Write a protein that binds this ligand. Structure first.
Ligand SMILES: C[C@]12CCc3c(ccc4cc(O)ccc34)[C@@H]1CCC2=O
Ligand SMILES: C[C@]12CCc3c(ccc4cc(O)ccc34)[C@@H]1CCC2=O
Lengths: 129, 129
């Protein structure tokens, strides 16, 4: 049924692992085929597995991206959760890091219905040699 | 006008300080007089400054409660932002720490229009004696 609070922590953490290894196939599978992503939040949503698969295609492709949690998945009892992680990637030629908080609502099947990634330039940090 | 990504970080960080010292008056003032709180997210919203002030009245009163950021406020360009923080208080007689993430939308006046505190028992750590 609707993911318990503990199941949300497990799903949202596994998602980070799939993003980490750039497993787009697996990432997309975690999404409902009509899910909506807003990354960055503030930007128009993208709906559907196809468009979403293209989003991660271009985002995890092209360059080197690692991601991992930096704190506990805060999970609720209505199939939702927010998590702190850090994205490592090459920005403006430089190896940079991006602090992000993802909020995720799942459905009665465990799949992500709604994805919202909170970040902007104030969360971007370029790293010295 | 609508708070900038940087204004958001400052606003949301000030909030935590207000909660921390339990300044209910100043906390309520950060709220639009028709703001809606959802703490814990999943629970029915509470509308209006009067119901919100009551919520913090009982939430911050009666017991001891500290709260401080445990990471950077992730802030977007639409007056929104999410923050990671920790809540210290007495739960079930025992001193406990609670991991929470607040999502907040601000209006064109810099006041909180929507509050959403993601957390549950899975984020509750009772401090061993
Ligand atoms: C998209 C991105 C790579 C991966 C990524 C970013 C931001 C938020 C994310 C949120 C996710 O849940 C998964 C991946 C990202 C980076 C911002 C700029 C960029 O290169
Ligand atoms: C409500 C509470 C005190 C304050 C508080 C809690 C949880 C989340 C919060 C989120 C906030 O943005 C502000 C205050 C709280 C505690 C959970 C149990 C408790 O008594």
């Amino acid at each position: 049924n609707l993911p318990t609070a503990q199941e949300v922590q497990g799903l949202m953490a596994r998602y980070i692992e799939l993003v980490d290894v750039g497993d787009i196939e697996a990432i997309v599978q975690m999404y409902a085929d009509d899910a909506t992503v807003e990354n960055p939040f503030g930007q128009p949503p993208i709906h559907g597995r196809e468009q979403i698969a293209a989003f991660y295609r271009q985002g995890l492709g092209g360059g080197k991206v690692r991601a991992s949690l930096t704190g506990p998945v805060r999970a609720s009892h209505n199939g939702s959760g927010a998590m702190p992680f850090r994205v490592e990637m090459v920005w403006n030629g430089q190896p940079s890091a991006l602090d992000v908080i993802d909020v995720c609502r799942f459905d009665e099947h465990g799949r992500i219905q709604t994805m919202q990634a909170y970040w902007s330039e104030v969360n971007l940090s370029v790293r010295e040699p």
